[PDB]
Design a protein around this ligand. Structure first.
Ligand SMILES: [Zn+2]
Ligand SMILES: [Zn+2]
Ligand SMILES: [Zn+2]
Ligand SMILES: [Zn+2]
Lengths: 206, 206, 206, 206
């Protein structure tokens, strides 16, 4: 749990995310809870040139290390950490199916039992606000109150979990659920879903 | 036909299945008929860390080896083995197109002559029941009576065959048929199919 | 232009075709014109285990070498060679988009100027006939009279050209055109096409 | 900034573009501003056999080096360079989603805040004209007046930027936006977009 071990894993999550097909338009950013703030990916540097020393520390006050530029989307990473104390890692991306559902401004309903992985019977969609603003941060903090992942309208996805492995896994799972919802929505609307009682049993079970 | 040769092939089937794009949401599980029960993948361990010694033996009574946790979906692997005596290997996954057809709760009709690979003129869709229950197991055992593969509503796919090679091959084939059905269903409904007599000739031919 | 150089290239075309995503359901077969008949891939052996000595020779009379089983789809490879004297190589596959258009039993119209690569202003779709029969062979020979590639209803694609490189390239191009047609057909029907005069200029130009 | 360093990067952009899935039907071509004209990929040679010495120089008058055949699509590369003085690199391809939007003859509207990367609130679609003609060149030069990327009806995409890295990145981004637009258009028409004022804030911000 040294700084450089946490920097290496951030980078491996960047690479793994690209290999899985979630980082298209070379748009993601990844962070971990650390000391009084977080370690996050820098802005501008392509994932493949990233080295341990590129990773930036941002404290609880929002001040970042000297001579390093944190991701341009860092504020809602900080908002996730303060809204969900149990979150230790955050994955953000512009994965295509998720972003496509976020353009319809729809929530993803319980079309598969794996929806319970993010905490309830849906995957919310928070309202649009200009990227990088205080207003975007508030909507994300309210959406993550009772869910571990949220879509952001006209934008993409945020997923948070106890470690980087699980956070990437969740992010990927939401992209599968997003693709299943768009695939069936083109055939029939609305899409058949499992009932709230059925989702309650699955939740107990997990 | 030693235990470790069967453990190696299970693992290679996991890897091959991931490479083919069927194991998204890192959800599949694979088993083989062995002695009085089966060898199956364990729960929790990511496919890439899997070693021969991770594979779990579950006997005819449903008791598993000490200190090892079998997949959480093991019961319907045991149900497949008792419903189809000729089955020696089982592949389960949550492949996207198959799962998308299973959310519409539709059977896949004879839209391509390769539908005959699973035994008849369709790929059934068994009714939803909570994952891991006795009730899910019964529906799978009834669906596999006269078919080698079945969709599971709101869930995914199960495919069984005489060996791991053929079972993976079948599972993959059903994912192609699922994608062909969803692609054409978005254009026209219903989709044109081959007649029962035409399917009967193909069956004789195979 | 030795037998084993032609066997090596067939195999490399199998591999390249799989890498491109055209050989799903491990269904393709490839042949080259040779002596009085052709060299073709064998039936049963998975592409990755294929060695030079697996390749089968079939003469002008349809007799194959002793102890080797040619692809189960060899007859329409022989039909292509007799219908188009200029063809030296044949690629057959069950590529998804192409097969999906072939289930709608539609021709692909001039939605892109690259349609001219197969000879005219369309990609025909020959009528279904049981795989491996004389009747399937006749429909393919009539469809290839004035086109270098054809869809086969409820089945897949056949493409022929002067060498293996160009034949694979053509096969791949038709799969792109098939995907473009299905993608736009789900939005609007009919799809806008280029006029016959415009296609005539492109043809002169190529 | 030697000739061979610019030739190496063109080639790496070809390869990277293929790896990303934008060069299907082996149709792209890439160029860089150089001396009084440009260096561009040659016609006929498959990307993978390309060596530094294959790259062709075309001067300001449109004369190319002796014994080398420039891409068959070179004229609109020259048109981009004269229409946008700030452009140092050009990427052209027939990427599927982009080409599919270009067959509907539609512009891509502001469905995502990343639309601002090409300069405004849309991605235009220039009218069809036979490939390789003076008329195609004029339409591309008018479309690129106030945008860094344009679709070409019934054809594909052109993207230009200050260097090869950014030009490929832009080209890829437009393919993501194209896929998001076609995915949502199949569900609802019209697709919800961000307002012109909202796009103006994003532009200031970038
Ligand atoms: Zn973002
Ligand atoms: Zn399952
Ligand atoms: Zn076939
Ligand atoms: Zn072009």
């Amino acid at each position: 749990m040294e700084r450089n071990k946490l920097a290496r894993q951030i980078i491996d999550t960047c690479l793994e995310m690209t290999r899985l097909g979630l980082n298209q338009g070379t748009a993601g950013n990844v962070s971990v809870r650390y000391q009084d703030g977080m370690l996050i990916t820098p802005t501008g540097i392509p994932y493949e040139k990233l080295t341990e020393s590129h990773i930036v520390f941002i404290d609880g006050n929002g001040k970042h290390e000297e001579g390093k530029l944190p991701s341009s989307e860092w504020r809602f990473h900080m908002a996730a950490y303060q809204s969900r104390p149990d979150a230790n890692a955050v994955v953000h991306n512009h994965a295509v199916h998720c972003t496509a559902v976020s353009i319809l401004n729809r929530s993803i309903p319980a079309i598969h039992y794996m929806i319970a992985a993010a905490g309830g019977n849906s995957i919310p969609c928070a309202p649009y606000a200009t990227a990088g603003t205080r207003e975007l941060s508030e909507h994300v903090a309210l959406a993550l109150k009772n869910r571990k992942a949220t879509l952001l309208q006209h934008h993409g996805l945020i997923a948070c979990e106890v470690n980087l492995e699980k956070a990437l896994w969740l992010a990927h799972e939401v992209e599968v659920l997003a693709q299943l919802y768009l695939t069936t929505l083109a055939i029939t609307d609305p899409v058949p879903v499992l009932s709230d009682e059925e989702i309650a049993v699955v939740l107990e079970k997990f």
